[PDB]
Structure 1
Amino acid sequence: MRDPFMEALGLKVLHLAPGEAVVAGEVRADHLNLHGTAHGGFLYALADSAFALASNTRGPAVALSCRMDYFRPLGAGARVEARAVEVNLSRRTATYRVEVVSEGKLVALFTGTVFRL
């Protein structure tokens, strides 16, 4: 299933399986904030995308509540990967942990819950 925003940000789906997904991307010049580092919205979009894909392997679902914890700043050129794993699957909701990693370092931690339509 094509995701226009993911493609606009240059994010690619690497792997998809029941309740899990791995999305990859690279911080580009157009993803930076005024300080020369990756904008918080880009790293979130990346993690949120892995989250969207992993959650929808279970059926139609939409983002309900998500948390993003930032640990390390990134500059242009940095290769990034977001790996989503299912921590809970219920009939009406599901929760996923998404780790954002760059060169073996945990850049950010995303926690999200979807509402299963």
Structure 2
Amino acid sequence: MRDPFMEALGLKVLHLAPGEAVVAGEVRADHLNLHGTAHGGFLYALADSAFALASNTRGPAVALSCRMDYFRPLGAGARVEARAVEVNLSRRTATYRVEVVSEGKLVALFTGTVFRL
């Protein structure tokens, strides 16, 4: 299905398989903060999106808690990827690790847990 928010940010799904996903995007001018780098929310949205698709492969679920650790800033024009991998799958919950990468560099690390419906 088409995700309005994902489309609004211009995010693309490069890979989607059981328990994993890769979403890509480009930092545009409308994604910057006052400092001129990619807004923390744009990077998080990229990761959150991969996280969402990967967990949906396991069935309907709702995110509970997510953590985002920022390591490197990205400037406008930067191409970035969110790579989601399943860390734990239980009957009622699941956790995923999402690496935000740009040109071989680990830009940020995302951890998210969902509640399986």
TM-score range, shorter chain: over 0.9
SS of 2:77's equivalent in the other structure is coil
**Structure 1: tracts of 5 or more residues without a match:** none
**Partners of 1:89 and 1:19 in 2: how far apart?**
9
Q: Deviations over 1:39-71 (max 9, x none)?
A: 000000000000000000000011110000000
**Partners of 1:56 and 1:50 in 2: how far apart?**
10
Q: CA deviation at 1:84?
A: 0.1
SS of 1:16's equivalent in the other structure is strand
**Structure 2: tracts of 5 or more residues without a match:** none
TM-score norm. by structure 1 comes to 0.99
TM-score norm. by structure 2 comes to 0.99
Give the total of aligned pairs.
Answer: 117
Question: Identity over aligned residues, as a percent?
Answer: 100
Consecutive aligned runs of 4 or more in structure 1 exceeding 2 Å deviation: none
Q: Deviations over 1:16-60 (max 9, x none)?
A: 000000000000000000110000000000000000000000000
SS of 2:38's equivalent in the other structure is coil
**Partners of 1:56 and 1:86 in 2: how far apart?**
11
Give the RMSD, CA atoms, in angstroms: 0.4
**Partners of 1:62 and 1:27 in 2: how far apart?**
27
**Partners of 1:115 and 1:66 in 2: how far apart?**
12
